[PDB]
Design a protein around this ligand. Structure first.
Ligand SMILES: *[C@H](C)[C@H]1/C(=C/c2[nH]c(/C=C3N=C(/C=C4\NC(=O)C(CC)=C4C)C(C)=C\3CCC(=O)O)c(CCC(=O)O)c2C)NC(=O)[C@@H]1C
Ligand SMILES: *[C@H](C)[C@H]1/C(=C/c2[nH]c(/C=C3N=C(/C=C4\NC(=O)C(CC)=C4C)C(C)=C\3CCC(=O)O)c(CCC(=O)O)c2C)NC(=O)[C@@H]1C
Ligand SMILES: [K+]
Ligand SMILES: [K+]
Lengths: 162, 158
């Protein structure tokens, strides 16, 4: 995968150059954000199961998707869904820590639009639930860190629209 | 990749969040950021000095070598490579790992140089010369990190 540092290294390396004044210090920017990033990852790690519970409650329950014939009907399918929300949360945290979205493109969104449509998984409902996760997490970590995790959530949501 | 990438990919392989140990590594790493950037700046501004002074000691140490055969191009080529290894080492220092150096410079090194018909031990030698120059431009502490990266390149060439 690529991180905030790896990315800057790679953009330099393709022009055969040492890191430039702006690539440096963007690096300083990152190194300074680590504490907040470690703080956020720790808190999400300890509220992971709780976050998805609130997420599901606010976007997927009491709808046509949990009714017979719905894509979230059948405990198996309900559990699959919750597992996918588990994946979005964990991977968005990896990304936030890395300070780069690349890991989402390669480990989460690779063939997901395609896989979902194949299985009948409602894409608009999924986006809805990702935007709820955003808010639930912001309610747990504050707006300051909430914006940061927001960017990664927005990324996932955006890559399902296409 | 980088130290951060290694931590994340570790957790990924166990399908879990970062552990207490992985978080502490991360915190100790980013804490040394300013110093790391100081080191990489040294290397950047002293590329020509290191290369030319190291080339100079190197060629005295090893006169039979394809960069010292009265062939420009060949000489130019070798001088360019030395500069590239400095760049890679600088990236590694910033990354907190030999990953940048490994991916860009180390994996395939024997196959490439062998193909080019450049004796490996001579490259190792030149690395010693470059190593010395760079160490001298910097503090005792700063020298520790940088030493190992130079050592790494030399490890891979034998
Ligand atoms: C929950 C918010 C929504 C929902 C989810 C849903 N997903 C599946 C099926 C799959 N989900 C994935 C996704 C991934 N697998 C991975 O390893 C990764 C990367 C870490 C991702 C993102 C895949 C590949 C599948 C297929 C395999 C499987 O079935 O387990 C289901 C099951 C659908 C079915 O018909 O079997 C469901 C229910 N569904 C909803 O209604 C929500 C909107
Ligand atoms: C210098 C210390 C030694 C030396 C080297 C030597 N190099 C060349 C030619 C090339 N070297 C490279 C190397 C790289 N390609 C990469 O991707 C990387 C990693 C980032 C490196 C370091 C390449 C590709 C070339 C080929 C020319 C080109 O750039 O297209 C030569 C010339 C060989 C020739 O026959 O032309 C030499 C001599 N020679 C010495 O004496 C030292 C031990
Ligand atoms: K919990
Ligand atoms: K090799």
């Amino acid at each position: 995968m690529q991180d905030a540092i790896t990315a800057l290294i790679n953009s330099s390396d393709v022009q055969g150059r040492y890191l430039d004044p702006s690539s440096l210090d963007k690096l300083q920017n990152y190194f300074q954000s680590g504490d907040m990033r470690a703080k956020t990852a720790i808190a999400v790690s300890a509220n992971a199961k709780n976050i998805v519970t609130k997420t599901v409650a606010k976007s997927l329950l009491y709808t046509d998707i949990t009714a017979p014939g719905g894509n979230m009907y059948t405990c198996r399918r309900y559990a699959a869904c919750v597992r996918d929300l588990d994946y979005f949360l964990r991977y968005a945290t990896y990304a936030m820590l890395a300070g780069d979205t690349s890991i989402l493109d390669e480990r989460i969104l690779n063939g997901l639009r395609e896989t979902y449509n194949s299985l009948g998984v409602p894409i608009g409902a999924t986006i809805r639930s990702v935007q709820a996760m955003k808010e639930v997490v912001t309610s747990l970590v504050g707006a300051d860190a909430g914006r940061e995790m927001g960017v990664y959530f927005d990324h996932i949501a955006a890559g399902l629209s296409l | 990749g980088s130290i951060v990438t290694e931590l994340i990919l570790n957790a990924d392989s166990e399908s879990r969040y970062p552990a207490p140990k992985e978080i502490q590594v991360y915190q100790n790493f980013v804490k040394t950021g300013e110093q790391r950037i100081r080191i990489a700046k040294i290397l950047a501004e002293n590329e020509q000095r290191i290369v030319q002074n190291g080339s100079a000691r190197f060629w005295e140490r090893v006169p039979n070598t394809p960069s010292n055969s009265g062939n420009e191009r060949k000489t130019a080529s070798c001088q360019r490579d030395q500069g590239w290894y400095i760049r890679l080492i600088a990236y590694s220092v910033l990354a907190g790992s030999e990953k940048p150096l490994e991916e860009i410079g180390t994996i395939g090194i024997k196959e490439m140089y062998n193909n080019l018909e450049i004796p490996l031990r001579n490259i190792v030698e030149c690395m010693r010369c470059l190593k010395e120059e760079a160490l001298s431009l910097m503090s005792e502490e700063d020298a520790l990190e940088v030493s190992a990266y130079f050592d790494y390149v030399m490890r891979s060439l034998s």
